[PDB]
Short mmCIF file of N, CA and C in Angstrom, two decimals:
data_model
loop_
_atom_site.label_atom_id
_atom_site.label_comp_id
_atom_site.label_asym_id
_atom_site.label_seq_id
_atom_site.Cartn_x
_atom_site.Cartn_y
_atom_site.Cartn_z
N UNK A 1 -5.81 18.35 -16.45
CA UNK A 1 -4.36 18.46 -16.65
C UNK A 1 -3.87 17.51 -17.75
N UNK A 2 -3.72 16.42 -16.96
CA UNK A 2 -3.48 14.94 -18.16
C UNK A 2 -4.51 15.23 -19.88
N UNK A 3 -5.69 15.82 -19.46
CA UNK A 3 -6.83 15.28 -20.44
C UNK A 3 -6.30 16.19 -21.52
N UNK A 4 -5.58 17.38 -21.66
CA UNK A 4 -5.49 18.06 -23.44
C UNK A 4 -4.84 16.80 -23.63
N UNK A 5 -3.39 16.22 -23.30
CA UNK A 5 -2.74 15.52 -23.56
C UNK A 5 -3.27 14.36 -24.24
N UNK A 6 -4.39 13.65 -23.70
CA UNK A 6 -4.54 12.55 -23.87
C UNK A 6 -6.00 12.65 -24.76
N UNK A 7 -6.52 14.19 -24.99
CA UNK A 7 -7.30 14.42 -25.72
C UNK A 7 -6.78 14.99 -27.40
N UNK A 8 -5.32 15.20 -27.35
CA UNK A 8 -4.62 15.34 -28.62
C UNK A 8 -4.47 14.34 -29.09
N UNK A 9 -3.89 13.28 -28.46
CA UNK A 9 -3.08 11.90 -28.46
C UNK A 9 -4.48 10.96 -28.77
N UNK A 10 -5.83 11.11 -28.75
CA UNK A 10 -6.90 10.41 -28.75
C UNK A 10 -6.92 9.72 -30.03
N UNK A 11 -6.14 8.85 -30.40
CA UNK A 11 -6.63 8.53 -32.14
C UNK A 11 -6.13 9.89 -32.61
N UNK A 12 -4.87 10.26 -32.86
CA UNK A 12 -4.22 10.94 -33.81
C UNK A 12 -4.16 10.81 -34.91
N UNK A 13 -4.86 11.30 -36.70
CA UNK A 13 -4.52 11.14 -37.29
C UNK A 13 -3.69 11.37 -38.38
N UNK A 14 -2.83 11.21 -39.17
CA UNK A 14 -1.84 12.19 -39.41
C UNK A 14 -1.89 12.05 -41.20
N UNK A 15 -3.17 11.64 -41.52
CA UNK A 15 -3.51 11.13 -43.04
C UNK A 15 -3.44 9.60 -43.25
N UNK A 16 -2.18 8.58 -43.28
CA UNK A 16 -2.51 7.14 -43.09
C UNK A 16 -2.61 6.40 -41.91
N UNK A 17 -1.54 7.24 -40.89
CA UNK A 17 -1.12 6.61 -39.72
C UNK A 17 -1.72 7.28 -38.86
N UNK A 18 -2.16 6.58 -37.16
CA UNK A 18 -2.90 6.83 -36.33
C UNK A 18 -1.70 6.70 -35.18
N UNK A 19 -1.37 8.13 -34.44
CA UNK A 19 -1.31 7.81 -33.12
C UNK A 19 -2.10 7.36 -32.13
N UNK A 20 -1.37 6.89 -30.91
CA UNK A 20 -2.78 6.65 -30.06
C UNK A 20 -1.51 6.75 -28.71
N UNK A 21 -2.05 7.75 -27.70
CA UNK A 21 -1.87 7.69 -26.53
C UNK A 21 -2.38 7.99 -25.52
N UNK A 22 -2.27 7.46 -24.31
CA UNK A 22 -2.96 7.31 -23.33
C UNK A 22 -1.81 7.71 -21.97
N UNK A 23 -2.41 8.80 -21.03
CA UNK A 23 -1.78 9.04 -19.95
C UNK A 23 -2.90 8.94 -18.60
N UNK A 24 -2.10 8.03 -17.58
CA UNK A 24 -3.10 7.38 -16.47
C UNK A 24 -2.24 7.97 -15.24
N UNK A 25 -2.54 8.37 -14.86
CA UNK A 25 -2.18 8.52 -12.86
C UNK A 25 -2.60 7.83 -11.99
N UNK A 26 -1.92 6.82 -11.31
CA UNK A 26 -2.26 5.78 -10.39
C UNK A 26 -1.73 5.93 -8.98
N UNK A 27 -2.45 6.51 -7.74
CA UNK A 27 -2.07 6.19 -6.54
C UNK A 27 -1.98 4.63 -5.75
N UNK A 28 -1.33 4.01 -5.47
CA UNK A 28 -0.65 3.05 -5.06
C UNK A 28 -1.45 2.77 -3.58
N UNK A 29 -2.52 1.82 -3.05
CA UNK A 29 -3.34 1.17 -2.62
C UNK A 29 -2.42 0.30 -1.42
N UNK A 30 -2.50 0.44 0.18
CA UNK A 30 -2.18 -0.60 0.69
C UNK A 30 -3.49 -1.15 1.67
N UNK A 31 -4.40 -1.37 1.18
CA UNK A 31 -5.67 -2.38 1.20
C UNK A 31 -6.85 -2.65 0.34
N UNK A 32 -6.98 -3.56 0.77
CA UNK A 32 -7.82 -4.31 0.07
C UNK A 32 -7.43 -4.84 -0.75
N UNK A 33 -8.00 -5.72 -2.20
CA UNK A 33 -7.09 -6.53 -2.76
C UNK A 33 -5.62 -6.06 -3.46
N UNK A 34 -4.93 -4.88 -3.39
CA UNK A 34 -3.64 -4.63 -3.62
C UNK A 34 -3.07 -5.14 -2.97
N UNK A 35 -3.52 -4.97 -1.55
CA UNK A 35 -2.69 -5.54 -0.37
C UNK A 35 -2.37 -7.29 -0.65
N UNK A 36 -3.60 -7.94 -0.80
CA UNK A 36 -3.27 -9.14 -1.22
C UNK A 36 -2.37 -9.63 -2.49
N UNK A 37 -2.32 -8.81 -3.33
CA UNK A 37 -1.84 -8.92 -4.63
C UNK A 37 -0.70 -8.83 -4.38
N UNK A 38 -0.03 -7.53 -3.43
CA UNK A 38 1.23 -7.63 -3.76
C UNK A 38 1.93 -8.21 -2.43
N UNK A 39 1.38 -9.00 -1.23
CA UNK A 39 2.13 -9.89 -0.91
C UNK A 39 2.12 -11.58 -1.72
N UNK A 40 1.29 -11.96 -2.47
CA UNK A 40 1.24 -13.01 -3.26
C UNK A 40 2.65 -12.79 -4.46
N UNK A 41 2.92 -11.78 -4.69
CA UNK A 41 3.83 -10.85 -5.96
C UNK A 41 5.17 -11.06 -5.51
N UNK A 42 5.31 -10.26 -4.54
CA UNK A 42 6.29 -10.43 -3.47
C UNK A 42 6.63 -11.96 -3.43
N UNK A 43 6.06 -12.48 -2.73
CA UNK A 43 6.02 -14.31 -2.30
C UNK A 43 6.69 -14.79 -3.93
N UNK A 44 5.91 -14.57 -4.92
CA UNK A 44 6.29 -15.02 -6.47
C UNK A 44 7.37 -14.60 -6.73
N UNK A 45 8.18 -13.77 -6.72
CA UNK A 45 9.42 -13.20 -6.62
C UNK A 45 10.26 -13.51 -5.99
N UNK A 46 10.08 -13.65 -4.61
CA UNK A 46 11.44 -14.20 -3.47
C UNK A 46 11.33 -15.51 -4.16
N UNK A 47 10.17 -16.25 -3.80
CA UNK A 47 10.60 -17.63 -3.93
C UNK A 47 11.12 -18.04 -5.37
N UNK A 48 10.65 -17.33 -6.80
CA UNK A 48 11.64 -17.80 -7.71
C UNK A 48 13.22 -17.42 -7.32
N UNK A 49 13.64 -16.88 -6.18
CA UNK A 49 15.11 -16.53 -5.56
C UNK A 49 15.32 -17.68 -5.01
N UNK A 50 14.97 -6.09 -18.17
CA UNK A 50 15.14 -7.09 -16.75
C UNK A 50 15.60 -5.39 -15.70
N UNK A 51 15.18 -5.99 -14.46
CA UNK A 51 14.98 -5.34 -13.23
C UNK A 51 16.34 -6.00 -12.98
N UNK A 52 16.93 -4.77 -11.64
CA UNK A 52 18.02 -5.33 -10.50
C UNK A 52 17.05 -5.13 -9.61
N UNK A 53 17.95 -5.37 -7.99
CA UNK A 53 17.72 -5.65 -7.03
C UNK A 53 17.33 -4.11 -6.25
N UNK A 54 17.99 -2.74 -6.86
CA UNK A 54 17.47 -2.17 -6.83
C UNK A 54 15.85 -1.65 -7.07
N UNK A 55 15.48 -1.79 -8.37
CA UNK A 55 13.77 -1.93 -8.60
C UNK A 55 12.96 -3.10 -8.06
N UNK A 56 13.62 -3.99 -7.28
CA UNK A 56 12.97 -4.34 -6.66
C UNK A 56 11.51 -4.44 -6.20
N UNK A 57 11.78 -3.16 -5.19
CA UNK A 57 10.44 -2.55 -5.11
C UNK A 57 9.65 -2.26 -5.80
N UNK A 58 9.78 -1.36 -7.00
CA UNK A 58 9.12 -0.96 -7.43
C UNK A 58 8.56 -1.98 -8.93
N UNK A 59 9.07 -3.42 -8.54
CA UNK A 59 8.50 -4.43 -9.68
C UNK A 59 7.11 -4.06 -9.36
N UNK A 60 6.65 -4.58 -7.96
CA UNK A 60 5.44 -5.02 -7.54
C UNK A 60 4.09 -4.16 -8.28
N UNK A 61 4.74 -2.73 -7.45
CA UNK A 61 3.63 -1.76 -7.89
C UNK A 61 3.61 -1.60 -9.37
N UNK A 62 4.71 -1.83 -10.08
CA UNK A 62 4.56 -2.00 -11.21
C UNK A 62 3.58 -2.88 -11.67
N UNK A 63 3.85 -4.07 -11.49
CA UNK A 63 2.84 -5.12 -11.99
C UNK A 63 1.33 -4.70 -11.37
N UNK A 64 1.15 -4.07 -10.11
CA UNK A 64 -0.19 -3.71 -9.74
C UNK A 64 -0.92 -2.82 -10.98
N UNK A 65 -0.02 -1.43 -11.20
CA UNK A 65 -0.76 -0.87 -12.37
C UNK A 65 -1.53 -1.62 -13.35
N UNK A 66 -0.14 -2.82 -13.94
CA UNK A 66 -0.99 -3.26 -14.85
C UNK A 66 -2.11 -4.28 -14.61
N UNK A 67 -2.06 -5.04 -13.50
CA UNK A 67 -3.59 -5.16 -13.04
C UNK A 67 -4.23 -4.53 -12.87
N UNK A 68 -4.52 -2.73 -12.68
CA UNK A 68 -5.80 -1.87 -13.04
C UNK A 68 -5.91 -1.67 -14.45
N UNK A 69 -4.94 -1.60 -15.05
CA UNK A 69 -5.29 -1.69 -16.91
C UNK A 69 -5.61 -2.65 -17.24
N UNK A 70 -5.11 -4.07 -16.78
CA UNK A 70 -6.46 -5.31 -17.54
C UNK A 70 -6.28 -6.60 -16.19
N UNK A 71 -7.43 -6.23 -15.51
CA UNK A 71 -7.46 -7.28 -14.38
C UNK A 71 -7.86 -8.72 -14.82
N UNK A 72 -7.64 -9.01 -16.10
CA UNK A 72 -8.63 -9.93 -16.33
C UNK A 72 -6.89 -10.63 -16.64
N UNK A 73 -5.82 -10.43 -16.68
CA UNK A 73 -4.95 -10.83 -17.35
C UNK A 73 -3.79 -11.55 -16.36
N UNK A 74 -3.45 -12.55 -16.47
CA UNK A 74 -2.53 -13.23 -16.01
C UNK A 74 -1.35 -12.64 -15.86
N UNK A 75 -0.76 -11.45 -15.07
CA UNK A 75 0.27 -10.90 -15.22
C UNK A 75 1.05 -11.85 -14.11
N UNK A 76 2.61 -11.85 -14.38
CA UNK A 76 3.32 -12.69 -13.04
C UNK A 76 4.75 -11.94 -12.81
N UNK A 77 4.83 -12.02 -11.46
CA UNK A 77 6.42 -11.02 -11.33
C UNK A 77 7.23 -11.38 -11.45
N UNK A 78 7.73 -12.60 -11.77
CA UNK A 78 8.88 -13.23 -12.52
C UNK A 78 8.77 -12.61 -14.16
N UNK A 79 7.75 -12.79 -14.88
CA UNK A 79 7.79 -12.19 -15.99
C UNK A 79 8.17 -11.06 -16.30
N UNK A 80 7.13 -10.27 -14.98
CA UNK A 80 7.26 -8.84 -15.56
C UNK A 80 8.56 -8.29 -15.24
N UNK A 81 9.39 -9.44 -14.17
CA UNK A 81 11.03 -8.82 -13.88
C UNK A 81 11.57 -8.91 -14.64
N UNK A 82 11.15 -9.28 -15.85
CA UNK A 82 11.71 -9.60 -17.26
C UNK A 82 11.35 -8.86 -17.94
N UNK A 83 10.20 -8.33 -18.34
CA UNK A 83 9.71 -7.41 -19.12
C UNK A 83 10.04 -6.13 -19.12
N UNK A 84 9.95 -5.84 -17.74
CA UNK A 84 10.08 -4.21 -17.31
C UNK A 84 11.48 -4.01 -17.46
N UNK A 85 12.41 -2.44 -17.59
CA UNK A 85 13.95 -1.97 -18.02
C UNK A 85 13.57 -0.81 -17.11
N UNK A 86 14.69 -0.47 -15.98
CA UNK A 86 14.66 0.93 -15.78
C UNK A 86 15.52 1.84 -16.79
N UNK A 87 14.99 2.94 -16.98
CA UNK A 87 15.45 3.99 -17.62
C UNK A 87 15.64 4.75 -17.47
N UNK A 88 16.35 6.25 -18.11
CA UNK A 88 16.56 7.31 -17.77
C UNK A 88 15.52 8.25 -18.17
N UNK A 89 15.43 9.45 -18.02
CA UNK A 89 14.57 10.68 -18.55
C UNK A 89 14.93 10.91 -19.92
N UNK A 90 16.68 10.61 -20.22
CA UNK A 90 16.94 11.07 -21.41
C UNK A 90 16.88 10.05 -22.32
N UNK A 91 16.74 8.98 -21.99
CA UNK A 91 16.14 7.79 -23.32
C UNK A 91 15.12 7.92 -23.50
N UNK A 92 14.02 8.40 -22.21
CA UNK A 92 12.59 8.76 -22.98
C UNK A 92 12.17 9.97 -24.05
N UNK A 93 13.30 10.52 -23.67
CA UNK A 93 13.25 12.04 -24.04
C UNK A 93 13.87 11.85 -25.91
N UNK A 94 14.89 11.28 -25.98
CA UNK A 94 15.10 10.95 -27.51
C UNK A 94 14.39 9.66 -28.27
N UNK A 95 13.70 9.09 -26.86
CA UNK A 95 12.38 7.85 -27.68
C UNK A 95 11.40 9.20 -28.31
N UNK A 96 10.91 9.76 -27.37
CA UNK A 96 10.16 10.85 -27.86
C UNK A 96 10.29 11.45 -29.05
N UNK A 97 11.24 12.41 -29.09
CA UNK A 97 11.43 13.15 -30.08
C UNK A 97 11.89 12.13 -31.38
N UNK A 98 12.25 11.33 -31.37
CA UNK A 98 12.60 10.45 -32.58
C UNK A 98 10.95 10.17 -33.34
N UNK A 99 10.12 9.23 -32.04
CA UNK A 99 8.84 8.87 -32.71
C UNK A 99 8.03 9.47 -32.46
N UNK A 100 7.60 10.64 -31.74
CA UNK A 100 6.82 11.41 -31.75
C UNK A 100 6.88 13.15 -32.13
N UNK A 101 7.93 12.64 -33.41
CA UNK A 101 8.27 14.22 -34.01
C UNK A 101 7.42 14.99 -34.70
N UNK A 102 6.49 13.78 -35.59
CA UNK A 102 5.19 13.98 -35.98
C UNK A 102 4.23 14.65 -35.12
N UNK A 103 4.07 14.20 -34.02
CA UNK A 103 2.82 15.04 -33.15
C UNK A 103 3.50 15.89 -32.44
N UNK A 104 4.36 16.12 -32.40
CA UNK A 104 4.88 17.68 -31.64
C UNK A 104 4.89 18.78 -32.38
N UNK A 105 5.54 18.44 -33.91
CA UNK A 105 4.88 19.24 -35.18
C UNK A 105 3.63 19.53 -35.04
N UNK A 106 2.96 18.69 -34.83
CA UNK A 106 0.85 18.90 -35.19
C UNK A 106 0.68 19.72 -33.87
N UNK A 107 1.39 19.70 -33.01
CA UNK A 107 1.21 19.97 -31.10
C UNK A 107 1.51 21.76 -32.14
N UNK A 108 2.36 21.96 -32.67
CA UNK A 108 3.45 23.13 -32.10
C UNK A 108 2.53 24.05 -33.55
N UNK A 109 2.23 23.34 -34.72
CA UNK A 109 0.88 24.30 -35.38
C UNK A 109 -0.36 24.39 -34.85
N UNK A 110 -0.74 24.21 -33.76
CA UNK A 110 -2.11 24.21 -33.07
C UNK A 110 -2.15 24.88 -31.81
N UNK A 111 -1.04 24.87 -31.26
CA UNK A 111 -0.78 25.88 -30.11
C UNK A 111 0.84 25.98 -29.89
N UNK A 112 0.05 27.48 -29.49
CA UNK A 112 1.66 28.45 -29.54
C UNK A 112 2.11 28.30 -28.01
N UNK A 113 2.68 27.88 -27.81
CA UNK A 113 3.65 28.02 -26.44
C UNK A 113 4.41 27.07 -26.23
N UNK A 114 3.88 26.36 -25.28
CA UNK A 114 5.20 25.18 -24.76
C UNK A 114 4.73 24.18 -25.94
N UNK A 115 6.03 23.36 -25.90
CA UNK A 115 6.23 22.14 -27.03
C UNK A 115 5.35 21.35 -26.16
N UNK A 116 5.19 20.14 -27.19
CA UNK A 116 4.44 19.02 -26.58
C UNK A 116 5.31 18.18 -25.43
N UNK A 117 6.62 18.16 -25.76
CA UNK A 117 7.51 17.23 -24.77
C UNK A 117 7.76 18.33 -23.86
N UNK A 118 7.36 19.70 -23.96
CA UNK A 118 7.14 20.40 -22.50
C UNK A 118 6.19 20.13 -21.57
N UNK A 119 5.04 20.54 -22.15
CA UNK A 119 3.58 20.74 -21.86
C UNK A 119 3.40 18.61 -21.25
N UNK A 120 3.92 17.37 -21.50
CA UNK A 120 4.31 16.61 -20.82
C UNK A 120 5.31 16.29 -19.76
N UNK A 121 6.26 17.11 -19.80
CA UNK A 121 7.03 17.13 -18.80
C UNK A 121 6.42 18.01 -17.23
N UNK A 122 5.34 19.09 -17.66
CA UNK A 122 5.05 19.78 -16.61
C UNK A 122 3.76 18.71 -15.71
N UNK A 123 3.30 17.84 -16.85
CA UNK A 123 2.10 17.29 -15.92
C UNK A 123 2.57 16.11 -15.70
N UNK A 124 3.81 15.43 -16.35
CA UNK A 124 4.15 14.36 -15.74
C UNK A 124 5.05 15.08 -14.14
N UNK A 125 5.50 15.90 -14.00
CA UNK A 125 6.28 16.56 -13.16
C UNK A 125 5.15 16.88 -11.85
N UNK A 126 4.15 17.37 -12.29
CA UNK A 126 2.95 17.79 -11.33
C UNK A 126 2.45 16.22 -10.28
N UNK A 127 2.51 15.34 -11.43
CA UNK A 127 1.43 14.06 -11.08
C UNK A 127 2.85 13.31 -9.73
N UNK A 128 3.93 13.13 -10.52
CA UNK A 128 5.14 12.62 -9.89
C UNK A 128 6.43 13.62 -9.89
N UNK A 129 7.33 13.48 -9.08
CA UNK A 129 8.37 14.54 -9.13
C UNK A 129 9.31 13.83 -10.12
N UNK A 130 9.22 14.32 -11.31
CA UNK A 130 10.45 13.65 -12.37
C UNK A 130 11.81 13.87 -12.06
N UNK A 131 12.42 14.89 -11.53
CA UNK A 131 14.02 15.15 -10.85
C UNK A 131 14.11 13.59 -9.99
N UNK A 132 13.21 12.79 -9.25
CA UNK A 132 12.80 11.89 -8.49
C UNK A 132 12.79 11.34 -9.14
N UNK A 133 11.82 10.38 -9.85
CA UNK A 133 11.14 9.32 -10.02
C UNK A 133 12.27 8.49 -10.69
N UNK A 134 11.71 7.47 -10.79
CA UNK A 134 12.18 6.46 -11.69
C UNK A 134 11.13 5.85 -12.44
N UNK A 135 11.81 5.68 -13.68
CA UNK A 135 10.98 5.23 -15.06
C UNK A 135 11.50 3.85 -15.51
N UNK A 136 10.61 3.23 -15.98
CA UNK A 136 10.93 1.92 -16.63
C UNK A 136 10.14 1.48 -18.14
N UNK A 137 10.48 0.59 -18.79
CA UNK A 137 9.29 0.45 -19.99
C UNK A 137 8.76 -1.07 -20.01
N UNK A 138 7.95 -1.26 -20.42
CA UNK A 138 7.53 -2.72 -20.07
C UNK A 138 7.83 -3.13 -21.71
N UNK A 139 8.26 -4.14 -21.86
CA UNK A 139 8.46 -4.68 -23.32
C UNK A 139 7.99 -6.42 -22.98
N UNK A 140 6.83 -6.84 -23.39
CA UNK A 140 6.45 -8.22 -23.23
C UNK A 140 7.09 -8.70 -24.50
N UNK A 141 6.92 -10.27 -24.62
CA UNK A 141 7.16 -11.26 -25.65
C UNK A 141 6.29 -11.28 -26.62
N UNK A 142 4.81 -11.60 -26.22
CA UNK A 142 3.95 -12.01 -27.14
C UNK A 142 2.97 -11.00 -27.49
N UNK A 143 2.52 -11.34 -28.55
CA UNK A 143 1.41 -10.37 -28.81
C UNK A 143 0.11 -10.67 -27.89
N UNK A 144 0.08 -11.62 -26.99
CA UNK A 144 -1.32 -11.80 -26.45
C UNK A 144 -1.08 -11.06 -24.59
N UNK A 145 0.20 -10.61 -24.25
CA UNK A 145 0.33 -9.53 -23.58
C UNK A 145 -0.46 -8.38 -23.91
N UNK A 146 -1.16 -7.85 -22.88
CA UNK A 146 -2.29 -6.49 -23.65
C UNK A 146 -1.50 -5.47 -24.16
N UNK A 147 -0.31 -4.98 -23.60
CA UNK A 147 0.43 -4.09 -23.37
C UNK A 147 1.39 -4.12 -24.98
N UNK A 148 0.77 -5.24 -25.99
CA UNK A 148 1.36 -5.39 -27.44
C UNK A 148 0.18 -5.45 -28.29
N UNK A 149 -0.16 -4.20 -28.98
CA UNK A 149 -1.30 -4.45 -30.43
C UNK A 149 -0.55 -5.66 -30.96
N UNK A 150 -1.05 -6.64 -31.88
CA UNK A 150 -0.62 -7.09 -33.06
C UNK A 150 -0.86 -6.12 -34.27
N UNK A 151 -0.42 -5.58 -35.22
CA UNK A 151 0.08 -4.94 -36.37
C UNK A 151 0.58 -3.91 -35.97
N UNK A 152 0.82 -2.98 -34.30
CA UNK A 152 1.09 -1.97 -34.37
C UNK A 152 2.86 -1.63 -35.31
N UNK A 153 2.94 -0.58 -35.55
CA UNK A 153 4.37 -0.34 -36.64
C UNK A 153 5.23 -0.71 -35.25
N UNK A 154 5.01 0.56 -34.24
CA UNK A 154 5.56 0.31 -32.67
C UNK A 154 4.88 1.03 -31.68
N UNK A 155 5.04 0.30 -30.69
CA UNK A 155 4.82 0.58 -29.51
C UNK A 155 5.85 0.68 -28.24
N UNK A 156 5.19 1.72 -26.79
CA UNK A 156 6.16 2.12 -26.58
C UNK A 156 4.69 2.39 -24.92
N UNK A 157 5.47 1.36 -23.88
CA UNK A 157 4.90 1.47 -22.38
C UNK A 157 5.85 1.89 -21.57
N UNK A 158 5.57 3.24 -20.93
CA UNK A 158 6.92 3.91 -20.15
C UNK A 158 5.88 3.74 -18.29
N UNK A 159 6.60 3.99 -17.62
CA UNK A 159 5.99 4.03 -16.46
C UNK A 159 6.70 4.48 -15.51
N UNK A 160 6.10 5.86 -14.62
CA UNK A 160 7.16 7.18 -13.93
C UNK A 160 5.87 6.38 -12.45
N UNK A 161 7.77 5.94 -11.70
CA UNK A 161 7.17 6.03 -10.06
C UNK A 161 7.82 6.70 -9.06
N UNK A 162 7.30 7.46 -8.21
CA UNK A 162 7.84 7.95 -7.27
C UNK A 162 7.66 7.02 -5.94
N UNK A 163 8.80 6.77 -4.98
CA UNK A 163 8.80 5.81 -4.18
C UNK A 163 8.37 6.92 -2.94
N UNK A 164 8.80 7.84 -2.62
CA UNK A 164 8.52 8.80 -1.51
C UNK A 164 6.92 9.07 -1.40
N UNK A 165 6.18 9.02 -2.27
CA UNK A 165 5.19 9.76 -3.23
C UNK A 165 3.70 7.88 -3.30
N UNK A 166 4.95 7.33 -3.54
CA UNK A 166 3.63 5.94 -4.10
C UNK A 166 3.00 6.23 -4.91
N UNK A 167 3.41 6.64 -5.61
CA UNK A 167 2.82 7.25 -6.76
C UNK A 167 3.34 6.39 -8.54
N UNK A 168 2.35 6.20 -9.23
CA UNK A 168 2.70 5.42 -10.84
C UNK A 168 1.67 6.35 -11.82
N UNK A 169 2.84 6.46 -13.04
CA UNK A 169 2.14 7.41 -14.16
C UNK A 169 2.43 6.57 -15.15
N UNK A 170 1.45 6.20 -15.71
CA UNK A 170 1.33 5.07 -17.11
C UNK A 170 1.41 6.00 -18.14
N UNK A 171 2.28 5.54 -19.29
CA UNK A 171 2.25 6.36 -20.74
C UNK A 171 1.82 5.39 -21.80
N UNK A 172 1.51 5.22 -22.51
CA UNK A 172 1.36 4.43 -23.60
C UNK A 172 1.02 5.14 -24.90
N UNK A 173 2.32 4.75 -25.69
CA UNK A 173 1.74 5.53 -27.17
C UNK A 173 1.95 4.54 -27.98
N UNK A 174 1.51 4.38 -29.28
CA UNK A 174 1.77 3.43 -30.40
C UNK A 174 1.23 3.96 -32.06
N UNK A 175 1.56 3.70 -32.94
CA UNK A 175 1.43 4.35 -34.13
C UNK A 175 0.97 2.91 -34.62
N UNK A 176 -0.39 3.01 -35.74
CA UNK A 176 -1.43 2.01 -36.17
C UNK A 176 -1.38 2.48 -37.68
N UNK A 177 -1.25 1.45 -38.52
CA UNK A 177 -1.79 1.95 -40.00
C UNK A 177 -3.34 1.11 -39.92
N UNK A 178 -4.16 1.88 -41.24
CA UNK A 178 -5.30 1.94 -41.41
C UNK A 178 -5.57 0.75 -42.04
#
């Protein structure tokens, strides 16, 4: 399902510039070390008592994802309550089409049917219920956050959770010159 997607998006090249995206589906873990992780997360959060109080919840599992994308990395939930923005469908939807007008073009001469911001909407829709979910983007400080190339032109970490569902869909795209 995910894989044309992320097999178009593989190192895109478009003559100088390189897309690159990546789509992950993550079911949401309550044992074993998740379990530990996210009452330690939790604990890091109350007790320092940007996200409201609403996403709340969904900081934690947030920050869990990105401990399966790089466990090796010091992530902390005070930070990432900083990092992470909830969003709408329709800011992703004109992030999209603004910077990824280029590969929907290359999407829409290579196959005839649904657009590319369709043909993503049906498998992000499949994986999580998008009418549902809630989306956020992670924007760190430094470049030694994984979730920031250094030279990329831009980058762009969206992340669709369904709370009914426990369910997290990682996006990551970014455009690289050569």
């Amino acid at each position: 399902p995910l894989d044309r997607i992320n097999d178009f998006l593989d190192h895109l090249n478009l003559g100088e510039r390189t897309i690159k995206g990546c789509l992950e589906a993550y079911s949401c873990k309550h044992t074993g070390t998740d379990k530990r992780l996210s009452i330690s997360l939790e604990h890091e959060i109350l007790d320092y008592l940007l996200l409201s109080r609403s996403s709340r919840k969904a900081l934690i599992y947030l920050v869990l994802t990105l401990y399966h994308m790089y466990p090796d990395y010091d992530f902390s939930a005070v930070k990432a309550h900083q990092f992470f923005t909830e969003e709408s469908w329709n800011t992703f939807k004109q992030i999209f089409e603004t910077y990824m007008f280029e590969a929907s073009k290359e999407w829409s001469e290579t196959y005839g049917g649904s657009s590319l911001l369709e043909t993503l909407y049906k498998a992000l829709d499949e994986v999580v219920k998008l009418p549902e979910c809630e989306i956020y983007s992670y924007n760190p400080d430094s470049d030694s956050d994984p979730f920031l190339e250094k030279g990329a032109i831009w980058s762009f970490n969206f992340f669709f959770y369904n709370r009914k569902l426990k369910r997290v869909v990682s996006f990551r795209f970014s455009c690289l010159s050569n």
